Design an enzyme around this catalytic site. Structure first.
Site, PDB file in Angstrom:
ATOM      1  N   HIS A  41      17.360  18.465  21.379  1.00 19.25           N
ATOM      2  CA  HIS A  41      16.052  18.754  20.930  1.00 19.25           C
ATOM      3  C   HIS A  41      15.094  17.511  20.743  1.00 19.25           C
ATOM      4  O   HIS A  41      13.978  17.755  20.736  1.00 19.25           O
ATOM      5  CB  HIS A  41      16.229  19.337  19.636  1.00 19.25           C
ATOM      6  CG  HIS A  41      16.586  18.776  18.383  1.00 19.25           C
ATOM      7  ND1 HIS A  41      15.848  17.441  17.806  1.00 19.25           N
ATOM      8  CD2 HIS A  41      17.413  18.810  17.387  1.00 19.25           C
ATOM      9  CE1 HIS A  41      16.265  17.412  16.743  1.00 19.25           C
ATOM     10  NE2 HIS A  41      17.382  18.066  16.314  1.00 19.25           N
ATOM     11  N   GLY A 143      13.917  12.243  10.148  1.00 19.64           N
ATOM     12  CA  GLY A 143      14.332  11.116  11.117  1.00 19.64           C
ATOM     13  C   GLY A 143      15.790  10.999  11.015  1.00 19.64           C
ATOM     14  O   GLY A 143      16.212   9.871  11.469  1.00 19.64           O
ATOM     15  N   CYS A 145      18.202  13.142  12.177  1.00 17.64           N
ATOM     16  CA  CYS A 145      18.794  13.500  13.293  1.00 17.64           C
ATOM     17  C   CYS A 145      19.491  12.651  14.272  1.00 17.64           C
ATOM     18  O   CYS A 145      18.907  11.311  14.546  1.00 17.64           O
ATOM     19  CB  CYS A 145      17.842  14.754  14.080  1.00 17.64           C
ATOM     20  SG  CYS A 145      17.507  15.718  13.183  1.00 17.64           S
TER      21      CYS A 145
HETATM   22  C1  XJ9 Z   1      15.026  17.367   5.863  1.00 18.71           C
HETATM   23  C2  XJ9 Z   1      15.690  17.024   7.029  1.00 18.71           C
HETATM   24  C3  XJ9 Z   1      17.153  16.815   7.167  1.00 18.71           C
HETATM   25  N1  XJ9 Z   1      17.601  16.987   8.370  1.00 18.71           N
HETATM   26  C4  XJ9 Z   1      17.192  16.929   9.388  1.00 18.71           C
HETATM   27  C5  XJ9 Z   1      15.700  17.256   9.468  1.00 18.71           C
HETATM   28  C6  XJ9 Z   1      15.218  17.795  10.771  1.00 18.71           C
HETATM   29  C7  XJ9 Z   1      14.972  19.239  10.643  1.00 18.71           C
HETATM   30  O1  XJ9 Z   1      15.516  19.949  10.059  1.00 18.71           O
HETATM   31  N2  XJ9 Z   1      14.104  19.802  11.729  1.00 18.71           N
HETATM   32  C8  XJ9 Z   1      13.567  18.901  12.915  1.00 18.71           C
HETATM   33  C9  XJ9 Z   1      14.407  19.221  14.049  1.00 18.71           C
HETATM   34  C10 XJ9 Z   1      14.809  20.439  14.586  1.00 18.71           C
HETATM   35  C11 XJ9 Z   1      15.268  20.968  15.961  1.00 18.71           C
HETATM   36  C12 XJ9 Z   1      15.357  22.212  16.155  1.00 18.71           C
HETATM   37 CL1  XJ9 Z   1      15.783  22.560  17.763  1.00 18.71          CL
HETATM   38  C13 XJ9 Z   1      15.363  23.372  15.029  1.00 18.71           C
HETATM   39 CL2  XJ9 Z   1      15.839  24.686  15.593  1.00 18.71          CL
HETATM   40  C14 XJ9 Z   1      14.825  22.608  13.785  1.00 18.71           C
HETATM   41  C15 XJ9 Z   1      14.629  21.478  13.568  1.00 18.71           C
HETATM   42  C16 XJ9 Z   1      14.157  21.131  12.312  1.00 18.71           C
HETATM   43  C17 XJ9 Z   1      15.019  17.360   8.279  1.00 18.71           C
HETATM   44 CL    CL Z   2      14.619  14.421  13.175  1.00 16.27          CL
END
Ligand code: XJ9
Ligand code: CL
Ligand code: XJ9
Ligand code: BR
Ligand code: BR
Ligand code: CL
Ligand code: CL
Ligand code: CL
Ligand code: NA
Lengths: 302, 306
Positions: A41, A143, A145
C-alpha cells in the site's frame, strides 16, 4: 525469580530496517540481502485506496519512484515486484548485516517480538501475541507501517505491520504478504471480530506462577478435557486440544502438576474469580505467554 | 493506538556483552572501549561471601587469573582495578562495536531497559523501574550477574544499572556503572532485605494521562485537590508523596489533555477509593506505576483522541 513480558534481543533485526518513500508516503522496509520488503500500500494515494487495482498501480510506477534510505545512504532500486500484499524492491547493494533468517507464518496464540520503527529507524521493542481473531494488540502510531515481528529460533520473521483497525488493534501480514485474518489492503469497512482468551497460554502462565512460588489457586480436584472444554466455551476461552496438553508437557513435568489438574484450577478461577487475590502480580488471567515463553524465561535460554 | 511496556532496541548493548570467568565463577561483563566492567563478587568463593575483604582477595590475583570471552574469542587481560563494587579489567583489544555511551546514576521512579544475559549471551529484553525501596523487580536466574540496565534516548546509551544479586523476596539489587549500590545493599551475604515498597505516584499519574491521550476518560471526576491533601490521602494507600518537581514533569501531558495535574490527582484519589468497577485502563485491572512521564511522551501520540 521474577516474571516479565520479555522480548527477544533485537540487534539482528535493527540492522535490517530502512526507510521507503513513494510519492508523499514514507514508511519502513526490511532489507535482507539485495531485496527490501514493505507493504504494497506504499504505492497508493488516498484516492487509490478506495478501490485499488494494485497490478495496474504498480505497472504505472518506475524503479525511480521508490526512494530507499539506509541510515544516511540512498540505496538504488533496480527492480520491483509484489508477492501478495508485500512489495519487493531489488536494490543495488546487499545488506552486509543480513542475519540468518526465515519467513515463518505463525498461528493464533503464538507470540513474537515487535521492533516498532519510524522513518526507517528502530524506536522500541515489545512482545505481542497473534490473537484468535487474527489481530494484534500492538502499540503503533502513524508512520509505523512496515515494522516487523519476529522470534529467534536464526531470525524467524512472522509479521509486517499494515494498518490499525477502528478499535485501535492492528492488522498485518506474514513476510510472504499473506494477511493474518480476513483483512484487506483497501479502504473499506473492516473491524476486529469478537475475540477469545488463549487457554493454553493461560495454563502456561499458571505454571509460571507455580514455578515462582504462587500456589493459592491449586486444589485437590481434576477434570476431564470434555468437562473443561464445556467451561471454556461458557467463558469465551479457546478449546483446549490434546495437542495443547502435549505442548504443556515440559511445564507439567517440571512442576509435577498434570495438565488436567491445572485445568481444574483454571475452571475454579473462571467460575469464582480471584477473591481479591493476584497471580504473578496480575488481577487478570494473562494469555500472552506461550508454554515455550515460560520455559525460555524460567530456564535462561540465550 | 495501543500501549505496551516498550524497551529500547537492544543491539547497541548486545555488542558489548562478554563472559568473565575467575576460578569456578562465570558471569557477564560489559566491554566498552578497552575495559570490561563486572561485579567484583566474581573474585569470591561461597565461603568468602560472609565477610569478604576484597582488597585481600584481589591482591592474590594476576591478570591471567581472569578469562574474558567475547563470542568465540578470548580477550587478554592486561590490567585490573576495583572501583567501589565493580571490577574493571583492562583488555588488549578495544570493542569495535562500542556505541556512544555515558554512565548515569538514576533516582527511584526512573525506568530503564534490561538486557538479561547468561554466559555473555543475551536472553531477552524487558523494562524495569528503580523502586522507591531501591530494588528492581527484574526477571533473573543464577548466572545473570553483570547484566545491565540502560536507556537509549538520543542515540547515546545511558547505562544506569549492573545486576549483582537477588534478595530473599525475589527482587533484585545492583549498582550504577561506577560500582555504587542503589540503596543500602552490600556485596556481602548479610541479613539485608528489601524495605517496604511504595507505589510511584508520578508514574501512575503519567499512565492515567496516557489513557486519556489514547481516548478514555471514565475515571475523571468533578473535583480537584490541594497537593497537601492529595499527599495525606496517597500515603494512606502506601503511595509515594508527589512533589512540585513531579507536578512540573507532568506539565506537557496536562497541556496535551487539558486536565490540570491536581485534577488528575483528584481522579487518582477516587480510583484508590473506588476501584475500577469491572473496567480496565489501558488493558490493566490494577494501577500501573512503571511508566514515567517521559516514557508516556516517548510512546503516545502527540494528538489526544478527544
Ligand atoms: C495509528 C496507526 C497505527 N498503525 C498504522 C497506521 C496506519 C493506518 O492505519 N493506515 C494507513 C495505511 C493504510 C493502508 C490501507 Cl490499504 C488501509 Cl485499508 C488502511 C490504512 C490505514 C496508523
Ligand atoms: Cl503508515
Ligand atoms: C536467581 C538469581 C537472580 N539473580 C542473581 C542471582 C545470584 C545471587 O543472588 N547470588 C550469587 C552472587 C551473590 C554475590 C554476593 Cl556478594 C551476594 Cl551478597 C549474594 C549473591 C547471591 C540469582
Ligand atoms: Br476430582
Ligand atoms: Br492487571
Ligand atoms: Cl506489555
Ligand atoms: Cl551469578
Ligand atoms: Cl542522554
Ligand atoms: Na487440582
Amino acid at each position: 525469580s521474577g516474571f516479565r513480558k520479555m522480548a527477544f534481543p533485537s540487534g539482528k533485526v535493527e540492522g535490517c530496517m530502512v526507510q521507503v518513500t513513494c510519492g508523499t508516503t514514507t514508511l519502513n522496509g526490511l532489507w535482507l540481502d539485495d531485496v527490501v520488503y514493505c507493504p504494497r500500500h506504499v504505492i497508493c494515494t488516498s484516492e487509490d485506496m478506495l478501490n485499488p487495482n494494485y497490478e495496474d498501480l504498480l505497472i504505472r510506477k518506475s524503479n525511480h519512484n521508490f526512494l530507499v534510505q539506509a541510515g544516511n545512504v540512498q540505496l538504488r532500486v533496480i527492480g520491483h515486484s509484489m508477492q501478495n500484499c508485500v512489495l519487493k524492491l531489488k536494490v543495488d547493494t546487499a545488506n552486509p548485516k543480513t542475519p540468518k533468517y526465515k519467513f515463518v507464518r505463525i498461528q493464533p496464540g503464538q507470540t513474537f517480538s515487535v521492533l516498532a520503527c519510524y522513518n526507517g529507524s528502530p524506536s522500541g521493542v515489545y512482545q505481542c501475541a497473534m490473537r484468535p481473531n487474527f489481530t494484534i494488540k500492538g502499540s503503533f502510531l502513524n508512520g509505523s507501517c512496515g515494522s516487523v515481528g519476529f522470534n529467534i529460533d536464526c531470525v524467524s520473521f512472522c509479521y509486517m505491520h499494515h494498518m490499525e483497525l477502528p478499535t485501535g488493534v492492528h492488522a498485518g501480514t506474514d513476510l510472504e504478504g499473506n494477511f493474518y485474518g480476513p483483512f484487506v489492503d483497501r479502504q473499506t469497512a473492516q473491524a476486529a471480530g469478537t475475540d477469545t482468551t488463549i487457554t493454553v497460554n493461560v495454563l502456561a502462565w499458571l505454571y509460571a506462577a507455580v514455578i515462582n512460588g504462587d500456589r493459592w489457586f491449586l486444589n485437590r480436584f481434576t477434570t476431564t478435557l470434555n468437562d473443561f472444554n464445556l467451561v471454556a466455551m461458557k467463558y469465551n476461552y479457546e478449546p483446549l486440544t490434546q495437542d495443547h496438553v502435549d505442548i504443556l508437557g515440559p511445564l507439567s513435568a517440571q512442576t509435577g502438576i498434570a495438565v488436567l489438574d491445572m485445568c481444574a484450577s483454571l475452571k475454579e478461577l473462571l467460575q469464582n474469580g480471584m477473591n481479591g487475590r493476584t497471580i504473578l502480580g496480575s488481577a487478570l488471567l494473562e494469555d500472552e505467554f506461550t508454554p515455550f515463553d515460560v520455559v525460555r524465561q524460567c530456564s535462561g535460554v540465550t
